[PDB]
Subunit: 115 residues, 4 copies
């Protein structure tokens, strides 16, 4: 599991459950191609997106469907989604956690890169 | 104006208006002594807390009454307040903006320090 | 001035100066069309991107070039950029401030929307 | 484990390791009395602070020694510490995670309250 996504809800103080998350890899023509996707779990986590053999160096985008999450809660949001765009780099053994903290008009994202 | 406080509301995307702010300074005897207080304006800003002359070196605490803010709006929030504690003016006088961004279960705070 | 961008640096506690910002608008055909661009001032602010007349309804993306910012300062940061994507003016004209707070492995963004 | 603390470092994109954390409970005379403390682990987590039988309703402060953490890294920080102050409330079965994201001149804190 070299890539995990974790999302929290700053309004309810809970995991953000059932949030859709799409991953893309940047193709040699500069377009984004689908690479992995899933819905966060009851713990706000999304595991099993990819494997070490598949997750090669490259630029990746992680799109988190914040707008659908807020609307399912009856809450008016600002952003269409949150996008996290980064280069994966093979400088020794590494696991990437992309964490996001959601508010209707604000979000933060942080990368926890370990091992 | 060496000390300014700005507060935003991440749920509405708006300045957080009428937020009470109390500032204290640590005394010779380790007590927190009341230093200045005020409330944010329509722009979410609080100016005029103190002066260049009064704002001497010290350890200061800026306590932002986030609970009263969220309660007056029908939200029962997590935190009692947001406390920002810092040493000021230890290399001479500086101008400090203390910004806070508020959600019911979360806050961030940043300091902008200029000469 | 219906669209303003403000960027702060959480490592230094300072405005983030000379940050390039590109804005795009989603076209009829789903493409991101270049809309306006500029760079933050000494105060970390970018004004004058557009006008009331030009800033029509639409889905807009504000791409903040955080990587070039951190690189020019000797830091190799995590993210390629910070992208803020939102629907604007769908209930009539509003004024939008898009604020971002930058660290090498993390960013937050907030929107202040006023009438 | 009704109370857990998790700290991340936004500059290195890692867990914040060996950060001292002190917990206090507000006494009937309004002073803060020591209640629990520890150092975050290699995963930036601090478990085993208290038990359900000990963790009664009351106001608690969690003080995270951010200033020592930054100084051990050779990095100049703003805040003396980060303090998170909240009321623990027995509305059914609940676990409190206090998460903090640290930058030298900024931090965010969020409460994840579950079960």
């Amino acid at each position: 599991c070299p890539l995990m996504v974790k999302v929290l809800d700053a309004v309810r103080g809970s995991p953000a459950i059932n949030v859709a998350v799409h991953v893309f890899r940047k193709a040699a023509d500069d377009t984004w191609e689908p690479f992995a996707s899933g819905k966060t779990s009851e713990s706000g986590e999304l595991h099993g997106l990819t494997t070490e053999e598949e997750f090669v160096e490259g630029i990746y985008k992680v799109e988190i469907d914040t707008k659908s999450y807020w609307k399912a809660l009856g809450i008016s949001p600002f952003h269409e989604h949150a996008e996290v765009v980064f280069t994966a780099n093979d400088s020794g053994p590494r696991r990437y956690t992309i964490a996001a903290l959601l508010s209707p008009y604000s979000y933060s994202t942080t990368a926890v890169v370990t091992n």
